[PDB]
Amino acid sequence: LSHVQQALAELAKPKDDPTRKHVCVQVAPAVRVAIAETLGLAPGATTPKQLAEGLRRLGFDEVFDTLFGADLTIMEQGSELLHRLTEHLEAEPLPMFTSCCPGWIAMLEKSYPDLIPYVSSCKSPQMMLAAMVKSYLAEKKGIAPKDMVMVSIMPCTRKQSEADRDWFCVDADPTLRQLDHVITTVELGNIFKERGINLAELPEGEWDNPMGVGSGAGVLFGTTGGVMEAALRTAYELFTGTPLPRLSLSEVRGMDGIKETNITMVPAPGSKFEELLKHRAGPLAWDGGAGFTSEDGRGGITLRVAVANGLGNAKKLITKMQAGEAKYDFVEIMACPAGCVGGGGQPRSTDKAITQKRQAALYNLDEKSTLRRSHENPSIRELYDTYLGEPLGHKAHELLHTHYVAGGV
Ligand code: SF4
Ligand SMILES: [Cl-]
Ligand code: NA
């Protein structure tokens, strides 16, 4: 009946049962860091590969890292951002909003439908990975999509509502879901405990690559700072020819839950962006953008970025944006005060700083110090080169992008 019950029923079938399906799971990073708490341990006290082993012991045929999906979201959203910027430089509006939090998307559709054109058309990391698994991977393995089950483990009590949006399906059959069942961190922790699985005592297991070949999770060593930051990095590095360091956002005075940064961008010498800048000098009235120039004509643009945590705080930001008192070009809205590490499906703690501990243990110090870039991932490159085409192209649009419905679904 429940989605947990349905997923477990699929896993309960012997692997040689004629009605057995190919049961896949993907795991969010916020789940990996918090799952140890379900055993009464500290965040990060169990390793990612111990979790992978635990999931394989439940019977999953494939065990994926949602970060693979996030590399797709970075490719698409980075390209989408650069495209909106390019169109506006040469005279899909700006500012652009992120779209990965279903709590934001619900409030958008119900209370701010006039803002729909400003929102990124990207699906979330979990939905992009799911779309890929029941298209590319199904084909590769010679499995009918109807014989694939996709399960995600999320820190979030809203991700099932995201997965359930009707058109997230295979070949216009709304009963053939791209993503079937979402299980929360605590629900998974309970499943393990009910079965006498102690993650902390497991050997290291292995991840599967959603490409269906090669070792590991199909994601390179290192960190990105998350999809919004890496989308900015994608756009910035193409625009300027220079690397964007890890961002450090600053709190906004007088606005709760809002952080910001400004990113100055000079176009690369000889680039189209350099040409556009010189040669061509709604509800959210754009202000034409923030620009600067120098005496010799080396002009640039300043990208103004905001992150809102908490939907109440986001409502106050939107009011100020509509008034023209807050001026931003790219805005992320997340429903949870602490973001996904503090999601509604996470363990409950008496520790007032538990989300800080989760954030700190989210990735190890070795990887924290190393910046990775999604477009350099050979698995991602191969997927675009041999299957998807170009970011924002027809196939990528079909599988990886979405739309919004005024009034909600
Ligand atoms: S911020 Fe909260 S509601 Fe939004 S995706 Fe993350 S866990 Fe879910
Ligand atoms: Cl996601
Ligand atoms: Na593997």
Residue numbers in the entry: 65 to 155, 161 to 350, 363 to 490
Recite the paper's sentences:
Theoretical studies suggest that the most probable PT pathway comprises of strictly conserved residues E282, S319, E279, and C299 (from surface to H-cluster, numbering corresponds to CpI), including two protein-bound water molecules (Wat826, Wat1120 4XDC19, chain B) located between E279 and C29915,16,20. In this study, site-directed mutagenesis (SDM) is used to investigate the PT pathway of two [FeFe]-hydrogenases, namely CpI and HydA1, which represent the largest (M3) and smallest (M1) type of monomeric [FeFe]-hydrogenases, respectively.
Crystallization of HydA1 exclusively succeeded for apo-protein, which carries the [4Fe]H-cluster but lacks the [2Fe]H-site.
